[PDB]
Write a protein that holds these residues in place. Sequence first.
Motif, PDB file in Angstrom:
ATOM      1  N   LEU A  92      20.825  56.600   7.638  1.00  0.00           N
ATOM      2  CA  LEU A  92      19.384  56.659   7.857  1.00  0.00           C
ATOM      3  C   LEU A  92      18.723  55.296   8.028  1.00  0.00           C
ATOM      4  CD1 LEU A  92      19.047  59.403   5.170  1.00  0.00           C
ATOM      5  CD2 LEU A  92      18.501  59.715   7.583  1.00  0.00           C
ATOM      6  N   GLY A  93      19.477  54.205   7.968  1.00  0.00           N
ATOM      7  CA  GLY A  93      18.966  52.893   8.309  1.00  0.00           C
ATOM      8  C   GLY A  93      18.047  52.194   7.323  1.00  0.00           C
ATOM      9  N   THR A  94      16.931  52.804   6.941  1.00  0.00           N
ATOM     10  CA  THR A  94      15.971  52.164   6.043  1.00  0.00           C
ATOM     11  C   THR A  94      16.083  52.719   4.632  1.00  0.00           C
ATOM     12  OG1 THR A  94      13.632  51.814   5.551  1.00  0.00           O
ATOM     13  CG2 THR A  94      14.192  53.793   6.776  1.00  0.00           C
ATOM     14  N   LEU A  95      16.017  51.828   3.642  1.00  0.00           N
ATOM     15  CA  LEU A  95      16.163  52.196   2.237  1.00  0.00           C
ATOM     16  C   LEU A  95      14.843  52.383   1.495  1.00  0.00           C
ATOM     17  CD1 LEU A  95      18.924  49.624   1.329  1.00  0.00           C
ATOM     18  CD2 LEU A  95      19.297  51.971   2.051  1.00  0.00           C
ATOM     19  N   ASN A  96      13.693  52.205   2.145  1.00  0.00           N
ATOM     20  CA  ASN A  96      12.424  52.484   1.487  1.00  0.00           C
ATOM     21  C   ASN A  96      12.311  53.974   1.195  1.00  0.00           C
ATOM     22  OD1 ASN A  96       9.815  52.747   0.586  1.00  0.00           O
ATOM     23  ND2 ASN A  96       8.862  52.301   2.571  1.00  0.00           N
ATOM     24  N   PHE A  97      11.795  54.315   0.010  1.00  0.00           N
ATOM     25  CA  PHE A  97      11.802  55.715  -0.414  1.00  0.00           C
ATOM     26  C   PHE A  97      10.950  56.599   0.485  1.00  0.00           C
ATOM     27  CE2 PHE A  97      12.700  53.642  -4.563  1.00  0.00           C
ATOM     28  CZ  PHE A  97      13.955  54.164  -4.728  1.00  0.00           C
ATOM     29  N   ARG A  98       9.738  56.165   0.820  1.00  0.00           N
ATOM     30  CA  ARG A  98       8.882  57.065   1.585  1.00  0.00           C
ATOM     31  C   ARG A  98       9.343  57.137   3.032  1.00  0.00           C
ATOM     32  NH1 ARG A  98       5.023  54.913  -2.223  1.00  0.00           N
ATOM     33  NH2 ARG A  98       7.114  54.930  -3.153  1.00  0.00           N
ATOM     34  N   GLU A  99       9.525  55.985   3.681  1.00  0.00           N
ATOM     35  CA  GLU A  99      10.111  55.981   5.015  1.00  0.00           C
ATOM     36  C   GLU A  99      11.426  56.746   5.059  1.00  0.00           C
ATOM     37  OE1 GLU A  99       8.807  54.820   7.820  1.00  0.00           O
ATOM     38  OE2 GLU A  99       6.971  54.217   6.778  1.00  0.00           O
ATOM     39  N   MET A 100      12.187  56.736   3.968  1.00  0.00           N
ATOM     40  CA  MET A 100      13.360  57.593   3.892  1.00  0.00           C
ATOM     41  C   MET A 100      12.971  59.065   3.851  1.00  0.00           C
ATOM     42  SD  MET A 100      16.598  56.959   3.984  1.00  0.00           S
ATOM     43  CE  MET A 100      17.682  56.000   2.951  1.00  0.00           C
ATOM     44  N   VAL A 101      11.854  59.390   3.204  1.00  0.00           N
ATOM     45  CA  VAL A 101      11.488  60.791   3.016  1.00  0.00           C
ATOM     46  C   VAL A 101      11.168  61.459   4.349  1.00  0.00           C
ATOM     47  CG1 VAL A 101       9.562  62.240   2.161  1.00  0.00           C
ATOM     48  CG2 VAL A 101      10.866  60.846   0.590  1.00  0.00           C
ATOM     49  N   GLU A 102      10.322  60.844   5.177  1.00  0.00           N
ATOM     50  CA  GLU A 102      10.096  61.363   6.521  1.00  0.00           C
ATOM     51  C   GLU A 102      10.925  60.676   7.603  1.00  0.00           C
ATOM     52  OE1 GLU A 102       7.898  59.844   4.670  1.00  0.00           O
ATOM     53  OE2 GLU A 102       6.817  58.275   5.760  1.00  0.00           O
ATOM     54  N   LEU A 103      12.064  60.077   7.253  1.00  0.00           N
ATOM     55  CA  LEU A 103      13.091  59.773   8.241  1.00  0.00           C
ATOM     56  C   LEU A 103      14.323  60.646   8.080  1.00  0.00           C
ATOM     57  CD1 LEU A 103      14.028  56.293   9.557  1.00  0.00           C
ATOM     58  CD2 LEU A 103      15.823  57.854   9.051  1.00  0.00           C
ATOM     59  N   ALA A 104      14.546  61.189   6.886  1.00  0.00           N
ATOM     60  CA  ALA A 104      15.726  62.016   6.639  1.00  0.00           C
ATOM     61  C   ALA A 104      15.803  63.254   7.519  1.00  0.00           C
ATOM     62  CB  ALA A 104      15.766  62.397   5.160  1.00  0.00           C
ATOM     63  N   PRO A 105      14.749  64.060   7.688  1.00  0.00           N
ATOM     64  CA  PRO A 105      14.891  65.242   8.549  1.00  0.00           C
ATOM     65  C   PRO A 105      14.933  64.920  10.027  1.00  0.00           C
ATOM     66  CG  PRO A 105      12.641  65.050   7.861  1.00  0.00           C
ATOM     67  CD  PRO A 105      13.392  63.987   7.110  1.00  0.00           C
TER      68      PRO A 105
END
Lengths: 504, 55, 467, 54
Positions: free
Chosen positions: B24-37
């Motif tokens: 998923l590339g980025t480790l920031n929690f929120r950017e991870m939250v709407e990058l995961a799907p």
Amino acid sequence: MLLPWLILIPFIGGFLCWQTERFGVKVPRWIALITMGLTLALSLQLWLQGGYSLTQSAGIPQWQSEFDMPWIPRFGISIHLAIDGLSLLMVVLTGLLGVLAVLCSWKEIEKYQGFFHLNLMWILGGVIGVFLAIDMFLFFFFWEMMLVPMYFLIALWGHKASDGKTRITAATKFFIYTQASGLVMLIAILALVFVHYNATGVWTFNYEELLNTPMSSGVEYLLMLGFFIAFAVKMPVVPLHGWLPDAHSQAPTAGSVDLAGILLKTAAYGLLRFSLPLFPNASAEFAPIAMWLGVIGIFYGAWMAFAQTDIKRLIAYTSVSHMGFVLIAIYTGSQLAYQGAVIQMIAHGLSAAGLFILCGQLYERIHTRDMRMMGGLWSKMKWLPALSLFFAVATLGMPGTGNFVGEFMILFGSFQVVPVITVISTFGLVFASVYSLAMLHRAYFGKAKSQIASQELPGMSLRELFMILLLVVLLVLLGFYPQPILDTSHSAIGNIQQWFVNSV
Amino acid sequence: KAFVVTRVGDVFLAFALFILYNELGTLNFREMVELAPAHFADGNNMLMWATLMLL
Amino acid sequence: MTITPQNLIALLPLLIVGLTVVVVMLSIAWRRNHFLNATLSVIGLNAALVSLWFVGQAGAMDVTPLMRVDGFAMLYTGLVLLASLATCTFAYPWLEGYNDNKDEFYLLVLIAALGGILLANANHLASLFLGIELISLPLFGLVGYAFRQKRSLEASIKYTILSAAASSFLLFGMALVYAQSGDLSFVALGKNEPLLLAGFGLMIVGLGFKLSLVPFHLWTPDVYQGAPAPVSTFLATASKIAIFGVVMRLFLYAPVGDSEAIRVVLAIIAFASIIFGNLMALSQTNIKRLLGYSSISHLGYLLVALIALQTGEMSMEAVGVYLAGYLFSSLGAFGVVSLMSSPYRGPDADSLFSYRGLFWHRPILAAVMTVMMLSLAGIPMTLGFIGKFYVLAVGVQAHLWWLVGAVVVGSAIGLYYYLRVAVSLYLHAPNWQYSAGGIVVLISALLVLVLGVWPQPLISIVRLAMP
Amino acid sequence: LLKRDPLNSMMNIPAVLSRFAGKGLLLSENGYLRWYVASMSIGAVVVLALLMVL
């Protein structure tokens, strides 16, 4: 322009210290400090004045400064000194380690002291010349002449001709194990140049035209093994590293600073600069053997580090564990992995130098080398063991130290390229903890009644604490803020990786 | 023993960290939250390795 | 052909030295003085070096069918003359303490210089024989000079029987070749039937005794321990330097040496010379036997170049420069050994255990032995490394992989004993021509250092000489 | 099992073989001059044999 001068100041200083030996005896200590100050001045001037943040895709030939001079015109052997970005990190590191070597040798007067320092500057200047080397013969000549003066250091200064164990085992294995492989890579150089001479028809020893020489498959593989053998006996790789603990445990710890902190650098420098770009398909075929040797080195050095009872051999067996990460980094197709190796490599030097200075410092405090003999010295020493705790802490991957970001970006890039050998490799951190705690608990934690000689302890002078304080603060800034030197090395690392990618 | 055991867990924790950067590339929690799907339209089998080893 | 003035100018080295023998012999019969004889002999050898310029005014030409004078021979005559100059300057301090008849020494060295400068100029198989024996008779007799010891006579007798034996093998081989070929001239030879090759193998036996090759090396320890150190300077340097030129010229000119049947045999001898030298050389605790052991390995490196003379033209200059570097290294080392025996002292007590210290006894002389001893090995900043580097290049050029590997592993084995002697001069301690002897070895130390760091001018001389 | 280092010892066997083989070669030398001349004959024999197989 500055490069001829920057490799010659070490040799000029050795001549002048030995000249003024007749004039005085307290002169070469003060002469040597200033001469290494001038070396770092020119090295730091190249860091600041030069365009360290240069173009990331300016080809394989790119140099901030370059020197050429005809030396032996019959083969085109020339003094082709040329400085890159990552080479400049190496030069500034060895200038700083030279300051530490000449500071640890302060207040050390003997029957002869000018001889020691002309040898000291000669060996440090040899490492600088390897770091600035693009012509193959100049690289090989400098590689082999930094190797002769350390023999005299281990021989005449390992102990002053009293015991025969400081020459016939330690120094002799150090000399033979390096020189046989040096001659191997020399005939490797010659086989490469001869196949280029058949291809084109000019006797050249220069890196730029030997870089793209046409070679049939099954031929350059043997030359790549020939380069790697000389590059595997200098940095400790699995089959041939028996010289390292003997060399560090017998030489004076200033000679050990040279032997560990900067002689281990040049082999991975050569794996990045001279072995990878010249042999792309051979290195692509050889890669998995390199990964297997890398993981074996990490696990092997930690076990041998846990099992050892003395201190100089203890830190000497940490080094072989550390270099396994670097070898796996180099033999992968990742830019981040190589940039992790550079920061791990600079931190490797900075985390071994402080430990060796302090281990030698502890021995001259207590006059006892065996680690398990002492114990519980914390109530006696006031600054040695606290600073030593952080250096043992900086050995493993503790963040706020440069070693963590170093080893750990290698692992990121390594998992990017290949999963299974990386997931084995990460476990060396657990083993790094166990030999780190073994050192700490056997030496400093306990009761001072473990040794009779642990009841009368001296004090610590100001200048040793000053040069220990500088290293701990320098190593913390590299751990917290490693961006400036990564921006320096980006373009050099990038073109090596792009050539290794595109040439396959 | 606590130090050895907690670093075994930290190796287990960093394993998922490598996998999350690979996937998923980025480790920031929120950017991870709407990058995961967004990244997970096709393959899901390897996320259980990330999350089980994160656990 | 007859005698023309071109022939006399070409022959000027063989002439000045011969006139020196006559004047030295007349001077011996007149006065029998050491000072006058030393002065007269060294003046003649210096006059021979001056006259090398005059033969350089003459081109590449023949004198008789026996000899051919080229620029190659100019350099080899020079090597032999400096060794003769070197041995007389080392003999005066050793012979000042000799009890009597101190004047026959220079006469024999002068005869040996005639023999050396006659094997430089060679074109016929007979000149090869007039040269080998002219130099042996002083080396028959000078290792037996000062026979009052119990080992000089021993050394002389062992060398005497063995050198006559080699000359008998060389002569019998020399004829068995001439049975097939109509002439014994090197060029006219070979104009691969087994008798010619069989005759060739016999000459290899008779030549490989004096070149100290692997199944003939047994003399090189013993006489080097037994002979005086001034004689060892000449016996280590001049004889084999002069002899190597004629054995190289035979294979260059003769078309039979082009064939692989002789090539394989000489390569195996070279392979085994390096190995059987550098393994038995470790255990020695005597400096003279130590240098004698190293001589076998140095002549082996010369052979691994000579086998690839026929592949690439770089082997000519490679052999030449290694000979120049090998001269300077051995002269400096053997001069220090002889300079420790400043009187005659009966039997000189020299050993590796006897050379503890020697830096706090005599610091300058210890530095010369260390510089030369590192130059023998292959350490850079020394002329031996450049010579080692060309023989590696020649072996790479001719794809002799086993032979170049033997040099590297032989270097790897042979580093050990050179380094002990270099460090043993740093352990804890247990007249006018003497200053002249110190000047000779100190001059050689400066030369080997400056031609290791800066080796181009010596190559210019060598390519100037090579045809 | 790692109280002594295995691979340092197992790559020391080149030195072990070289020193022991060097000791054997030193013992092969005699000092009696008859065997020196026998060495000369046995070198001539093998050189002629090695030339006749070529």
